[PDB]
UniProtKB/Swiss-Prot annotation:
Protein name as annotated: Phosphoenolpyruvate carboxykinase [GTP], mitochondrial
HAMAP family, A to Z: PEPCK_GTP
Cofactor note: Binds 1 Mn(2+) ion per subunit.
EC number: 4.1.1.32
InterPro entries in the record: PEP_carboxykin_GTP_CS (IPR018091), PEP_carboxykinase_C (IPR013035), PEP_carboxykinase_GTP (IPR008209), PEP_carboxykinase_GTP_C (IPR035077), PEP_carboxykinase_GTP_N (IPR035078), PEP_carboxykinase_N (IPR008210)
Family as reported in the entry's similarity comment: Belongs to the phosphoenolpyruvate carboxykinase [GTP] family.
Catalytic reactions of this protein: oxaloacetate + GTP = phosphoenolpyruvate + GDP + CO2
Entry's Gene Ontology molecular function annotations: GTP binding; manganese ion binding; phosphoenolpyruvate carboxykinase (GTP) activity
Tissues in which the UniProt entry reports expression: Present in liver and kidney.
Gene this protein is translated from: PCK2
Residues in coiled coil: none
Positions annotated to bind GDP: A273, C274, G275, K276, T277, N278, P323, R422, W490, F499, F504, N507
Length: 596
């Protein structure tokens, strides 16, 4: 932290001074990303009452939030574009609520800003965070400058992005301007809840792609305040990607190594698994196979000159949902969060550790708990000890299975893209698309039952129909080595209501089959919905009692209903903005189903 701003290049300096004149902070501090700066931030936050130390651990801390500020606020998150159709398709003609993004006119946006930001930082320091999304020397990296009046945001941004000398050295006119305030100018007129400043009634999270800008007011929480997280890495980046010939996606990236030493990378989009345990940190249950994590949330991907789709993880840390995390379910996540981690809204134990539903850390008898609301808590309370959206924020380099190339500036070559869903019947364990357009249709048809095309529903940066068009056009690149496209479902239930598939490390068996399909192996049989493994070409050895036929249902009634639902979904939500190729894939599926 320094009051000297001389190191900022002219455009970044102009942005900072604009924000200073608007917000009227007490002082202005440039962030340098150093260990000493982190200690200073922590000291101030503890003195402020925001952070509680967690002396059970090495350098871990706990924040609690006002209960009104605990998650992204979708209804207050908007895309600002001169033309509404650049942002979103027509509103559902039958009157249903829009589900593919919210639009705000420039006029309305500017008026909203003028009600909120003038003087909003009175009495507070403004912090300047120059940051890189991706290794700063990557040709795929993009830079930002975030100004904020929240030290909690600064600490978390330092974990989640690259903040440091390397960033300032590269900064020029081309960066995303990110303006953030918690919206609680001093002096306060009433006490805070849990020392957590916010202005819930006036929260606004706005994206203005034509101005390379994000503006966020009133929330200190996660996706609303850590402007790299979602606002930049998905919403602004997706529109940049459409304009510049790349892809910005809500996908984990993993490396899979076969027993005999070949390595392939895969990306996967899962809805409602955002922040949760996934494939990316999996300990495989097939001997000899290895899995490494490149990223577990965002993938930025671009074809190289050889036609290979290269991906980077544009983040530097994990911002994961805490409840359900345990040594049993995710030992790699547990290792990651054991030190130098900031926890938000988890329980606090009498021995100086943390608590959430599912945690299996051994504790001595008589250890007691305080909930995220700061109240005594015991098992059986109607309310959970940790808020369901409570978080850890930890550096990625602490994850024991990080891929050697996880921060390689060149990116990793992607050979498969996997879409995920959670369905108790009908949708098989794994299916491969017949080709690119068919695969784009599969991604468009994802569910979470809510539809969540490409796991991007809350995160589109521009018209979702044009996003689908952009995916289709991407497949036309000459000499592209297009990844194969798959859809998976870990969650089928048997004629007794329990899971057919054991999941967890056994999911490596599905990745192994995918791996073979990448290599061109003749290990599939055709069905109305795509290729599936031949019985015996999915490794079920060591899984006695697992019934292949219940993993690969082919139910005509299910698919007839699925097509009816998709037809209604596309009609209402995309209308004429749906690409013809997607409708053609639905029509194709309908006809194959008719004959089945
Ligand atoms: Mn996510």
């Amino acid at each position: 932290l320094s009051t000297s701003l001389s190191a900022l290049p002219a455009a970044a300096r102009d942005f900072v001074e604009e924000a200073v004149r608007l917000c009227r902070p007490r002082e202005v501090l440039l962030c340098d990303g150093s260990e000493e700066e982190g200690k200073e931030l922590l000291r101030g936050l503890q003195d402020d009452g925001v952070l509680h130390p967690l002396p059970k651990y090495d350098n871990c801390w706990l924040a609690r939030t006002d209960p009104r500020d605990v998650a992204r606020v979708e209804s207050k998150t908007v895309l600002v574009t001169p033309e509404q159709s650049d942002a979103v398709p027509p509103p559902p003609p039958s009157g249903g609520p829009p589900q593919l993004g919210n639009w705000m006119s420039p006029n309305a946006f500017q008026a909203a800003v003028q009600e909120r930001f003038p003087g909003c930082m009175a009495g507070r320091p403004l912090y300047v965070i120059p940051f890189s999304m991706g290794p700063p020397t990557s040709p795929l990296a993009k830079l930002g400058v975030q100004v904020t009046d929240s030290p909690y945001v600064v600490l978390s941004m330092r974990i989640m992005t690259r903040v440091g000398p390397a960033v300032l050295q590269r900064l020029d006119d081309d960066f995303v301007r990110c303006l953030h305030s918690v919206g609680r100018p001093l002096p306060l007129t009433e006490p805070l809840v849990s020392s957590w400043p916010c202005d819930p009634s006036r929260v606004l999270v706005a994206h203005i792609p034509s101005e390379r800008r994000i503006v966020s007011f009133g929330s200190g929480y996660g996706g609303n305040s850590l402007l790299g997280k979602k606002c930049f890495a998905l919403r602004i980046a997706s529109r940049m990607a459409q304009q510049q010939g790349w892809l910005a996606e809500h996908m984990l990236i993993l490396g899979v190594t076969s027993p005999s030493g070949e390595k392939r990378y895969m990306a996967a989009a899962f809805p409602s698994a955002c922040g949760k345990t996934n494939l990316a940190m999996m300990t495989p249950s097939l001997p000899g196979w290895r899995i490494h994590c490149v990223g577990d949330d965002i993938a930025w991907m671009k074809f190289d000159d050889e036609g290979r789709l290269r991906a980077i993880n544009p983040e530097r840390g994990f911002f994961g949902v805490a409840p359900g995390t345990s040594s049993r379910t995710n030992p790699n996540a547990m290792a990651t969060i054991a030190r130098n981690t900031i926890f938000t809204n988890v329980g606090l134990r009498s021995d100086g550790g943390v608590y959430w539903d599912g945690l299996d850390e051994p504790t001595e008898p008589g250890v007691t708990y305080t909930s995220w609301l700061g109240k005594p808590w015991k098992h059986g309370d109607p309310e959970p000890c940790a808020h369901p959206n409570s978080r850890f924020c930890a550096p990625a380099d602490q994850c024991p299975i990080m891929d050697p190339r996880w921060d390689d500036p060149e990116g990793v070559p992607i050979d498969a893209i996997i879409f995920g869903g959670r369905r108790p019947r009908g949708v098989p364990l794994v299916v491969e698309a017949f080709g690119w357009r068919h695969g784009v249709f599969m991604g468009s048809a994802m569910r979470s039952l809510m539809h969540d095309p490409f796991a991007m529903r809350p995160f589109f940066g521009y018209n979702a129909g044009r996003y689908l068009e952009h995916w289709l056009s991407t497949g036309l690149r000459s000499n592209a080595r297009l990844p194969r496209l798959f859809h998976v479902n870990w969650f089928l239930r048997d004629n007794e209501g329990r899971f057919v598939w054991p999941g967890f490390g056994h999911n490596a068996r599905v990745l192994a089959w995918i791996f073979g399909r990448i290599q061109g192996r003749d290990t599939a049989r055709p069905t109305p919905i795509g290729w599936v493994p031949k019985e015996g070409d999915l490794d079920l050895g060591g899984l006695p009692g697992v019934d292949y036929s219940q993993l690969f249902p082919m139910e005509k009634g299910f698919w007839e209903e699925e097509c009816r639902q998709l037809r209604e979904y596309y009609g209402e939500n995309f209308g004429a903005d749906l690409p013809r190729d997607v409708m053609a894939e639905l029509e194709g599926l309908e006809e194959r189903v008719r004959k089945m």
